[PDB]
Design a protein around this ligand. Structure first.
Ligand SMILES: O=C1O[C@H](CO)[C@H](O)[C@H](O)[C@H]1O
Ligand SMILES: O=C1O[C@H](CO)[C@H](O)[C@H](O)[C@H]1O
Ligand SMILES: [Mg+2]
Ligand SMILES: [Mg+2]
Ligand SMILES: [Mg+2]
Ligand SMILES: [Mg+2]
Ligand SMILES: [Mg+2]
Ligand SMILES: [Mg+2]
Ligand code: NA
Ligand code: NA
Ligand code: NA
Ligand code: NA
Ligand code: NA
Ligand code: NA
Lengths: 1011, 204, 193
């Protein structure tokens, strides 16, 4: 039959799900978590052949390796080896929508392996095979004989091979289908790949064995006492002599233990579970688990005879912690959490969806180093090691069922259908059976973007019933349905309501108090970090700290899903949707992370780190008030470093030990500071530094910082008179001014500064002119689905109003000779099809000091869309190695995303002033700049700027960063004002009004001089 | 209207119903019944089945029904008759004044059951007054309680008709047969005859 | 496969459940509850043959009526026809308790019917067959070709026959199994037929 087109068949001969086993036969090894001789890895080199449909697979295959097959590494995604293309689609299914059928051409990966089995494994017991992840469905044969079938790409499928194997050499044949009825529930927004992408293992268990075990921890009111309860079930030979012993250890010290024979309590008229036993261990003053301090104990479960023979042992790390919602708050160990979360896909730019320990570790380090304490498994169960790592390093995890049916219409078409209940239920139930004992998992999620169907309510109820220790959440159908214990919207804004029909996204603050509402609110997705984004991030954090029931959210998302491609020259470059011939596709929409695919950070990462700080500060004269947001730990590895500087010139500094209790405060009185009479602004900067290294950070790591302006001494100092006066030479076409080795040429037809010389060298490649546009950011573009298109998006509104094509009309250009200077005055009008969009009036004042003071006043028609920026631009001839500025930095920062930047004197290499976002756009801006130095030039005022080798026109017209080419010279964009970047979502206008340039009249001033 | 699910011979009784692998099969017996019968006005209450212990699949199914058809209560007696899977306390053979305190699944006196701390649901016996042979002793005791206690809202006698089968003697004369009479074994003899009426509908 | 020994397969090709239908093509008849010419009963006399297990059913039964079958009324329980004994057990399952399997000796009733349809049904439209109750599970064939399978002895199982119908005589073959994994959920205190 075609089991792959029948949602009523999701497996055949598959064994029951259970928590991670290893079948140790020695308790100390189980205790130590050392490797088990009974658990082998079958990962490695396999043989593989690709076919275009299951019907092209030759019978012989079952019996022997195909001559033309290749040897490949497993686990792997076959698209990663070039067999066929990964497809990048967001909502629209990659196959024609006609459940439960799939296309007749359905890529089939034939995998095979000849491996050995020790005679010993076959003499006794059971030998099973475990496939951790096969996408999307598969048939399995052993030694030419059919074993079984499996669906659900994100959970292990296990089969008993006991009767199929023989001593020595054995051969598996795995027929993997890329598409199946399972695909209808796997519509997540990511690359559509396939293959045996997770570990393959062989496990030996005894005939009489531990078939499942659940560990629970309940506490007294103040957490000073706990009871660890472990329910153990066995399969096999039930006899009176059997016993279970569960022992709990803290390090090498056994803190508790219990032994009992099998036979649980009576539960109904027919009796009880004679194959089950529940052990209860009392633990006094348990060390509690949290993301702040991931204390763990080890529970060892021995199955043995009463007289002392160990049958086998299973084990797990145990985190004593309670998760509960009470009075509207999500509490962990009785304190209210503040989730600093992020959504994380399992993505590797080279290996596709295959995960490895190193990568995971690297992600976890970066997450914690950047103040994240939580992660959501968007949108499926993860590789098993992920949990172990979150348990050990400490991150709260939302474990999510692999169910997403976004492309259906309406979205709940399948989840509301009872025929799909069995397929959905396995996705929820096997997830919970596998991951229930991990302390890191604190909330279960029912899947994502599948509307709200009655299947969701049934499954919500099932979980509440088998595992009362964790809340259940689910966003579909409006985020506050009867299937969720937490209001968990995606992209609801802080103050702005988006009253869509049926599934409105209310402001989060308003959502909490709707009549009759009492649940806590934690966004399952927020702050869409696509390209130049995270604008408005701070607004969220401010609300979360002010409203108790606003308990945080999971940013979307950690890592861009870009894949590596290689050019003619064999150089690697980042690819996105459509880059593999895939179509339809959604282009760059797969790239929305805080980090690039190789884990290099995007600038927004630093804004998230700062807003997610665990220490808040207030300043009152000489006193610094530090407040801790930690709930459970004292500041035992932290010191406060403070520094005061006058416009970047260091004046005094020091360090003071931090000793603040969780949720407590510490006051810190700073010493008597400078009183410099010398002009400028004094700035205080404090940093929290961790003097000792940790499991997840190095000595000296900085975890928090904050700045304040102290006193300012405005300059009243009159600059000396010059022993000089610029001369003006006029012609019909130009105004030329000379002063010493300096000259400036103003074009009388264009009305702009067309050239400057220092000495004899030309300084400009293009004239200095106003600029009102930017190469559109992903957020300005707004698309979530690659022709189409939104007329309301920023980019379309500007295009349509003519901003990108407006032409300067000269209205006036005059030259005047002053007492000690020459003054040029100009006015220009920008029009579009008869409409005047902007008017720029300027004065250029060149004095005997060689300084050129430029004053600019712009008018913007009130009825035109607010422009991207109000500034000047030019191509300088010079290419300098470094950029030195006095202003916000050091990383790129925009009006709505500059809280993390600090005002100081910064000095970076030119290239650091450009951000290689995969999909190019305006980037590298630095705001709040008071002085800019480059080559021989110096610019002073109060502006924002960017500087790099690529023009806005170029960024705008190129689709991939690898295709950019440095231009001659350096392009400099100096703005008086620049619009916010947005990002509440990337598919609708999202720049808050206060960050819109809607004032109508704008004024800025700069002085350009040489140094 | 009761789903076709009964797993009485399991040990313990919820062996299958508490196991997710059996959720799909149970689910169809409940959902296909609702899909077929939901427009009939005579159906006032849905039942999840009979003597299947109390398993998580029951909680799941109770909830499914509550969301799909809010118009009718859902009841289920298994596992103690007052579990989270029932909107009605619906015991079988609970006595009027006498408690039968079996472990795990006690049968309290119905009057007492009502007022157990925190209990507020209506009580209607899914089965009571077992009419097997010369029976019905004590019937009036139930009725008097039903009348006096608002929340005691009655019950369903067990049962309407004897499941006896006709057999014929040597001469072709028909006779009423029971368990074992067909060579069937093991069997539970006359235990299939518990009606208020004989199989041909003549009253007891 | 032994679909009758797998709780994960409770039906194959079965259509979705729904309230009683009649496909009336005249509003007034639907209003009055009168009969619909689009709904016909196949109750009556059928051909039946008993086997000790599904493995004993000859393949030819698919293509033609077995000379040894008998002609019986449908609906009916086979034990009432004396083909085998009805069993009276209360609690204890009537088969060994070993989910999901059932005994290899599993009484099998082979039911068959020769019928035909209105020309217009061959024309267009969807023609389905509805079995209001089959105990405990069964496979269905039409004109020798396999149609589907169903479980749950107390609800209707419907299959689309549109693509199997032919002009003139048509033959249904229904293979019913006394025991199936569905029996595990059918332990009621009553005669097991
Ligand atoms: O709503 C969503 O937005 C993200 C947009 O990138 C991504 O599609 C997530 O999977 C989805 O749940
Ligand atoms: O508990 C019960 O009692 C009756 C005893 O005759 C019969 O077995 C019913 O089916 C059952 O629910
Ligand atoms: Mg399938
Ligand atoms: Mg010991
Ligand atoms: Mg031996
Ligand atoms: Mg989606
Ligand atoms: Mg079956
Ligand atoms: Mg019973
Ligand atoms: Na809060
Ligand atoms: Na995306
Ligand atoms: Na400290
Ligand atoms: Na671009
Ligand atoms: Na009453
Ligand atoms: Na009885």
């Amino acid at each position: 039959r075609r089991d792959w087109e029948n949602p009523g068949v999701t497996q055949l001969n598959r064994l029951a799900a259970h928590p991670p086993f290893a079948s140790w036969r020695n308790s100390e090894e189980a205790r130590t978590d050392r490797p088990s001789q009974q658990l082998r890895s079958l990962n490695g080199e396999w043989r593989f052949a690709w076919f275009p449909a299951p019907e092209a697979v030759p019978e012989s295959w079952l019996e022997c390796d195909l001559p033309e097959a290749d040897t490949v590494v497993v686990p792997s995604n076959w698209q990663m080896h070039g067999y066929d293309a990964p497809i990048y689609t967001n909502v629209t299914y990659p196959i024609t929508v006609n459940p439960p059928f799939v296309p007749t051409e359905n890529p089939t990966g034939c995998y095979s392996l000849t491996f050995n089995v020790d005679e010993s494994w076959l003499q006794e017991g059971q030998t099973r095979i475990i496939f951790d992840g096969v996408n999307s469905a598969f048939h399995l044969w052993c030694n030419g004989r059919w074993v079984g079938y499996g669906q659900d790409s994100r959970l292990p499928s296990e089969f008993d091979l006991s009767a199929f194997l023989r001593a020595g050499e054995n051969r598996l044949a795995v027929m993997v289908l890329r598409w199946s009825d399972g695909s209808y529930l796997e519509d997540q927004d990511m690359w559509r790949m396939s293959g045996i992408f997770r570990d393959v293992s062989l496990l030996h268990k005894p005939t009489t064995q531990i078939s499942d075990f659940h560990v629970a921890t309940r506490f007294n009111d103040d957490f000073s006492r706990a009871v660890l309860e472990a329910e153990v079930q066995m399969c096999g030979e039930l006899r009176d002599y059997l016993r279970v012993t569960v022992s709990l250890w803290q390090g090498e010290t056994q803190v508790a233990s219990g032994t009992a024979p099998f036979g649980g309590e009576i539960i109904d008229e027919r009796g009880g579970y004679a194959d089950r036993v529940t052990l209860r261990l009392n633990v006094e003053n348990p060390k509690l688990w949290s993301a702040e301090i991931p204390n763990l104990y080890r529970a060892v479960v021995e199955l043995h005879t009463a007289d002392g023979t160990l049958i086998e042992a299973e084990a797990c790390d145990v985190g004593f912690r309670e998760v509960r919602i009470e009075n509207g708050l999500l509490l962990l160990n009785g304190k209210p959490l503040l989730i600093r979360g992020v959504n994380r896909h399992e993505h590797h730019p080279l290996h596709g969806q295959v995960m490895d320990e190193q990568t995971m570790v690297q992600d976890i380090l970066l997450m914690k180093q950047n103040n994240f304490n939580a992660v959501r498994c968007s949108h499926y169960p993860n590789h098993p090691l992920w949990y172990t790592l979150c348990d050990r390093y400490g991150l709260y995890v939302v474990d999510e069922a692999n169910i997403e049916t976004h492309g259906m219409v309406p979205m709940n078409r399948l989840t509301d259908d009872p025929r799909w209940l069995p397929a959905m239920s396995e996705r929820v139930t096997r997830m919970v059976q596998r991951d229930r004992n991990h302390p890191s998992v604190i909330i279960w999620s029912l899947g994502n973007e599948s509307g709200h169907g009655a299947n969701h309510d049934a499954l919500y109820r099932w979980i509440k019933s088998v595992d009362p220790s964790r809340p259940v959440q689910y966003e579909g159908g409006g985020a506050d349905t009867t299937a969720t214990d937490i209001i968990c919207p995606m992209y609801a804004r802080v103050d702005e309501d988006q009253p869509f029909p049926a599934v409105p996204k209310w402001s989060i603050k308003k959502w909490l108090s709707l009549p009759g509402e009492t649940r806590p609110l934690i966004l399952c997705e927020y702050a869409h970090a696509m390209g130049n984004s995270l604008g408005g991030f701070a607004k969220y954090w401010q609300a979360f700290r002010q409203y108790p029931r606003l308990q945080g959210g999971f940013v979307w998302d950690w890592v861009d899903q870009s894949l590596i491609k290689y050019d003619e020259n064999g150089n690697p470059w980042s690819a996105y949707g459509g880059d593999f011939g895939d179509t339809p596709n959604d282009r760059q929409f797969c790239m929305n992370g805080l980090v690039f695919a190789d884990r290099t950070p995007h600038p927004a990462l630093t804004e998230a780190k700062h807003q997610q700080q665990f220490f808040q500060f207030r300043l009152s004269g000489q006193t610094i008030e530090v407040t801790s947001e930690y709930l459970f730990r004292h500041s035992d590895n932290e010191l406060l470093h403070w520094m005061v500087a006058l416009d970047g010139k260091p004046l005094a500094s020091g360090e003071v030990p931090l000793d603040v209790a969780p949720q407590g405060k510490q006051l810190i009185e700073l010493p008597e500071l400078p009183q410099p009479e010398s002009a400028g602004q004094l700035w205080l900067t404090v940093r929290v530094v961790q003097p000792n290294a940790t499991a997840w950070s190095e000595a000296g790591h900085i975890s928090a910082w904050q700045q304040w302006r102290l006193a300012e001494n405005l300059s009243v100092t009159l600059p000396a008179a010059s022993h000089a006066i610029p001369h003006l030479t006029t012609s019909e076409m130009d105004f030329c001014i000379e002063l010493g080795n300096k000259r400036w040429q103003f074009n009388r037809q264009s009305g702009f500064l067309s050239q400057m010389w220092i000495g004899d060298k030309k300084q400009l490649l293009t004239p200095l002119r106003d600029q009102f546009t930017r190469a559109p950011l992903d957020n300005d573009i707004g698309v979530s689905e690659a022709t189409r298109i939104d007329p309301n998006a920023w980019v379309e509104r500007w295009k349509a109003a003519g901003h990108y094509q407006a032409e300067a009309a000269l209205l006036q250009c005059t030259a005047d000779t002053l007492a000690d200077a020459v003054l040029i005055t100009t006015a220009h009008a920008w029009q579009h099809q008869g409409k005047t969009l902007f008017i720029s009036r300027k004065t250029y004042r060149i004095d005997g000091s060689g300084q050129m003071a430029i004053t600019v006043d712009v008018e913007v028609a009130s009825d035109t869309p607010h422009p991207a920026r109000i500034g000047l631009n030019c191509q300088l001839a010079q290419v300098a190695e470094r950029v030195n500025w006095l202003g916000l930095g050091p990383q790129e920062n925009y009006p709505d995303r500059l809280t993390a930047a600090c005002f100081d004197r910064w000095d970076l290499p030119l290239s650091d002033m450009y951000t290689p976002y995969v999909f190019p756009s305006e980037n590298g801006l630095r705001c709040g700049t008071r002085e800019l130095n480059y080559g021989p030039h110096q610019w002073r005022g109060d502006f924002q700027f960017n500087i790099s080798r690529y023009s806005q026109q170029q960024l705008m017209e190129t689709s991939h960063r690898h295709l950019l080419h440095a231009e001659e010279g350096t392009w400099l964009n100096i703005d008086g004002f620049h619009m916010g970047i947005g990002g509440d979502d990337s598919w609708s206008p999202s720049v808050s009004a206060e960050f819109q340039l809607s004032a109508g009249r704008y004024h800025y001033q700069l002085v350009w001089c040489q140094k």
